[PDB]
Design an enzyme around this catalytic site. Structure first.
Site, PDB file in Angstrom:
ATOM      1  N   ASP A 152       0.816  -1.206   0.000  1.00  0.00           N
ATOM      2  CA  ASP A 152       0.000   0.000   0.000  1.00  0.00           C
ATOM      3  C   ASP A 152       0.861   1.272   0.000  1.00  0.00           C
ATOM      4  OD1 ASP A 152      -2.423   1.413  -0.064  1.00  0.00           O
ATOM      5  OD2 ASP A 152      -2.784   1.218   2.085  1.00  0.00           O
ATOM      6  N   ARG A 156      -0.274   9.135   0.450  1.00  0.00           N
ATOM      7  CA  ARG A 156      -1.079   9.224   1.675  1.00  0.00           C
ATOM      8  C   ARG A 156      -0.437   8.421   2.815  1.00  0.00           C
ATOM      9  NH1 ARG A 156      -3.699   5.882  -1.909  1.00  0.00           N
ATOM     10  NH2 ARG A 156      -3.701   3.681  -1.284  1.00  0.00           N
ATOM     11  N   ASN A 157       0.349   7.412   2.449  1.00  0.00           N
ATOM     12  CA  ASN A 157       1.004   6.543   3.420  1.00  0.00           C
ATOM     13  C   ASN A 157       2.467   6.832   3.714  1.00  0.00           C
ATOM     14  OD1 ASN A 157      -1.405   5.291   4.018  1.00  0.00           O
ATOM     15  ND2 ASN A 157      -1.161   3.700   2.459  1.00  0.00           N
ATOM     16  N   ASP A 170       1.983   3.437   7.516  1.00  0.00           N
ATOM     17  CA  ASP A 170       0.845   2.558   7.250  1.00  0.00           C
ATOM     18  C   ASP A 170       1.204   1.140   6.827  1.00  0.00           C
ATOM     19  OD1 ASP A 170      -1.684   1.479   6.948  1.00  0.00           O
ATOM     20  OD2 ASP A 170      -2.479   3.110   5.738  1.00  0.00           O
TER      21      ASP A 170
HETATM   22  N1  ANP Z   1       3.230   9.359  12.831  1.00  0.00           N
HETATM   23  C1  ANP Z   1       2.351  10.292  12.422  1.00  0.00           C
HETATM   24  N2  ANP Z   1       2.628  11.580  12.654  1.00  0.00           N
HETATM   25  C2  ANP Z   1       1.782  12.520  12.221  1.00  0.00           C
HETATM   26  N3  ANP Z   1       0.651  12.402  11.567  1.00  0.00           N
HETATM   27  C3  ANP Z   1       0.384  11.095  11.350  1.00  0.00           C
HETATM   28  C4  ANP Z   1       1.143  10.022  11.727  1.00  0.00           C
HETATM   29  N4  ANP Z   1       0.541   8.853  11.328  1.00  0.00           N
HETATM   30  C5  ANP Z   1      -0.553   9.235  10.723  1.00  0.00           C
HETATM   31  N5  ANP Z   1      -0.714  10.591  10.704  1.00  0.00           N
HETATM   32  C6  ANP Z   1      -1.848  11.385  10.165  1.00  0.00           C
HETATM   33  O1  ANP Z   1      -3.106  10.736  10.454  1.00  0.00           O
HETATM   34  C7  ANP Z   1      -3.775  10.479   9.226  1.00  0.00           C
HETATM   35  C8  ANP Z   1      -4.542   9.179   9.383  1.00  0.00           C
HETATM   36  O2  ANP Z   1      -3.647   8.057   9.501  1.00  0.00           O
HETATM   37  P1  ANP Z   1      -4.140   6.524   9.455  1.00  0.00           P
HETATM   38  O3  ANP Z   1      -5.018   6.265  10.593  1.00  0.00           O
HETATM   39  O4  ANP Z   1      -2.926   5.669   9.297  1.00  0.00           O
HETATM   40  O5  ANP Z   1      -4.992   6.592   8.102  1.00  0.00           O
HETATM   41  P2  ANP Z   1      -5.597   5.409   7.268  1.00  0.00           P
HETATM   42  O6  ANP Z   1      -6.701   4.761   8.029  1.00  0.00           O
HETATM   43  O7  ANP Z   1      -4.537   4.508   6.787  1.00  0.00           O
HETATM   44  N6  ANP Z   1      -6.293   6.263   5.998  1.00  0.00           N
HETATM   45  P3  ANP Z   1      -5.658   6.697   4.502  1.00  0.00           P
HETATM   46  O8  ANP Z   1      -4.195   6.601   4.755  1.00  0.00           O
HETATM   47  O9  ANP Z   1      -6.161   8.067   4.289  1.00  0.00           O
HETATM   48  O10 ANP Z   1      -6.176   5.698   3.513  1.00  0.00           O
HETATM   49  C9  ANP Z   1      -2.663  10.434   8.172  1.00  0.00           C
HETATM   50  O11 ANP Z   1      -3.129  10.776   6.833  1.00  0.00           O
HETATM   51  C10 ANP Z   1      -1.723  11.512   8.637  1.00  0.00           C
HETATM   52  O12 ANP Z   1      -2.174  12.843   8.238  1.00  0.00           O
HETATM   53 MG    MG Z   2      -4.227   2.043   7.060  1.00  0.00          MG
HETATM   54 MG    MG Z   3      -3.131   5.006   5.297  1.00  0.00          MG
END
Ligand code: ANP
Ligand code: MG
Ligand code: MG
Ligand code: ANP
Ligand code: MG
Ligand code: MG
Lengths: 303, 6, 303, 6
Positions: A152, A156-157, A170
């Site tokens: 993935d 975004r990741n 991610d």
């Molecule tokens: N270590 C980190 N530090 C700062 N911001 C973070 C971090 N990890 C995640 N984020 C932020 O939190 C958001 C959501 O993360 P996450 O819960 O991993 O999304 P997801 O469920 O995988 N969705 P998507 O990635 O949008 O398909 C990310 O897009 C970042 O903006």
């Molecule tokens: Mg995820």
């Molecule tokens: Mg993600």
């Protein structure tokens, strides 16, 4: 007593303080916070804390479990670091290093000149794009070396640090490929069609080569300031297009050097695509002086 | 979205 | 559910098979065994498994807890590796790498020409003694670098591998000295008087310098084939002797090179004693070709 | 023994 067999990753909830929402995931929330005495030498440490919604499904909880588990085994400057887990009570909190500028997709969009949230700086220069590419490729090289396939990789990741360093994040879809060097998907599930290699879309086979295909799309996102890949085509049309041998165009005014990298990543035969170490090697002579000091590529571990 | 159930 | 927050070190009891008793500790048993699929790439792995007696006291269980906890954080070729912990049920099993030849004290005694259990080989040659000294010093250097003081370095606590490599073990008395570089003992407890530095016997202060004093005694045990230090004096007499500035004699026919090392280790002022890295440096030019490939001393981590 | 309670 249970006390005599602790979890080394366990962190006391008392040490965590939540400040604000960084973002919302599909089944949880990510908050910026501060943690007291969780790293030796550091009295307080800035962190990102992920929670799981009380309403999260079993599938989502299983995914988060794998995600946190694989992160525990990684130690790379270009891969987001897990710092601890608060499981003594509810809700469970996964404490990670803070990536102040959030995800790369959001970051790139904010750099569009007409962005409402423009930080007051120009879009990425050629040099900055190469640096990003090398950091992402180094983190991916490390992951590949540990015998895991991300599955993935997308803007975004990828996350951006206070100093603008990009790191891989991610690991929800990450799979162990130690014994066979590939992962064949079993049932049905949510797949990032626009970032997938033709052989993965066709047979559900994921390898480090299919991660390279995704890396190419990330370069496309970087050079287009995160526009939507295949804008105008539905996921079903994209699946058919790519399997038929199609790929994305070069974004407007894309630097020739980056275009060349994308061409390497989008070869139909997965065996002809480059490796992440080869990508870092191609870019190693024009990177920040600190790179060799922190990269997996220049490390003794890269053997 | 970014994902397709398949 | 508890399942969503696992312990990465947890090993299924089903994978462990016990073969024979390797030794008996003060509050448990160590068994040689075989473990199935606990290391990637290895279908089966030879292991040493430590248990805690059902009758173990709280003090003993607290000690074992610290011991297993500190081991989890170490990764050095010259420090005994922890492989997993079986806590799903009773009794708790701590799975470690197997050191086929057991503890150094036992091993040395078996090399006495008149030993009933003599393995059919000569006592350690000068070269073999230097190699042992360098391995023990390298493992200790790593421990010091991680900011821990062993406090119980002795031949009984060094282990010997199938290929005769010596590694540091028994972290029961090990203490974190990150913030202050020393550990001052609080109450009363069992202390290895014959291996202790004068300042530790006097003020209860343990530092990497007091570990160096112990290292000197280990060299004395190696060159005497594990005779008892200060044989003829009681623990109380030894305490008084050492605090007054006394130390051990050189064993009969002790190699001059080893004698010189002991002289460095037994200086009264802890600040004048060498460091473990300095010991490895003194011996580095006459070691096995593989040493630089596996040592902490030659590693990138030694910074 | 190898240890003394002190
Ligand atoms: N270590 C980190 N530090 C700062 N911001 C973070 C971090 N990890 C995640 N984020 C932020 O939190 C958001 C959501 O993360 P996450 O819960 O991993 O999304 P997801 O469920 O995988 N969705 P998507 O990635 O949008 O398909 C990310 O897009 C970042 O903006
Ligand atoms: Mg995820
Ligand atoms: Mg993600
Ligand atoms: N990893 C290992 N591999 C093989 N043998 C081992 C290992 N660890 C310990 N042993 C053996 O088991 C014995 C008992 O170990 P342990 O339980 O640590 O002793 P202890 O309680 O510290 N006692 P002592 O060291 O004699 O003061 C050791 O002397 C070794 O002979
Ligand atoms: Mg012991
Ligand atoms: Mg012990």
């Amino acid at each position: 007593s249970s006390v005599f067999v602790p979890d080394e990753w366990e962190v006391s909830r008392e040490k965590i303080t939540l400040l604000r929402e960084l973002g919302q995931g599909s089944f949880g929330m990510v908050y910026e916070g501060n943690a007291r005495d969780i790293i030796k030498g550091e009295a307080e440490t800035r962190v990102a804390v992920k929670t799981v919604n009380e309403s999260a499904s079993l599938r989502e909880r299983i995914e988060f479990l794998n995600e946190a588990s694989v992160m525990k085994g990684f130690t790379c400057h270009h891969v987001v670091r897990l710092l601890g887990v608060v499981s003594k009570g509810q809700p469970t909190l996964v404490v990670m290093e803070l990536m102040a500028h959030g995800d790369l997709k959001s970051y790139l969009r904010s750099l569009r000149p007409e962005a409402e949230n423009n930080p007051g700086r120009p879009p990425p220069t050629l040099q900055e794009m190469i640096q990003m590419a090398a950091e992402i490729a180094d983190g991916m090289a490390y992951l590949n070396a540990k015998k895991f396939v991300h599955r993935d990789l997308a803007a975004r990741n990828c996350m951006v640090a206070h100093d603008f360093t990009v790191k891989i994040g991610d690991f929800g879809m990450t799979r162990d490929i130690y014994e066979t060097d590939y992962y064949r998907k079993g049932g049905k599930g949510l797949l990032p069609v626009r970032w997938m290699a033709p052989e993965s879309l066709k047979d559900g086979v994921f390898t480090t080569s299919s991660d390279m295909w995704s890396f190419g799309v990330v370069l496309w996102e970087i050079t287009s300031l995160a526009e939507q890949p295949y804008q105008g085509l539905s996921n079903e049309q994209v699946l058919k297009f790519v399997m038929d041998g199609g790929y994305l165009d070069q974004p407007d005014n894309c630097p020739e050097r980056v275009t060349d990298l994308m061409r390497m990543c989008w070869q139909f035969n997965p065996k002809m695509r480059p490796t992440f170490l080869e990508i870092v090697n191609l870019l190693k002579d024009d990177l920040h002086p600190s790179f060799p000091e922190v990269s997996f590529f220049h490390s003794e571990e890269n053997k | 979205g970014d994902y397709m159930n398949m």
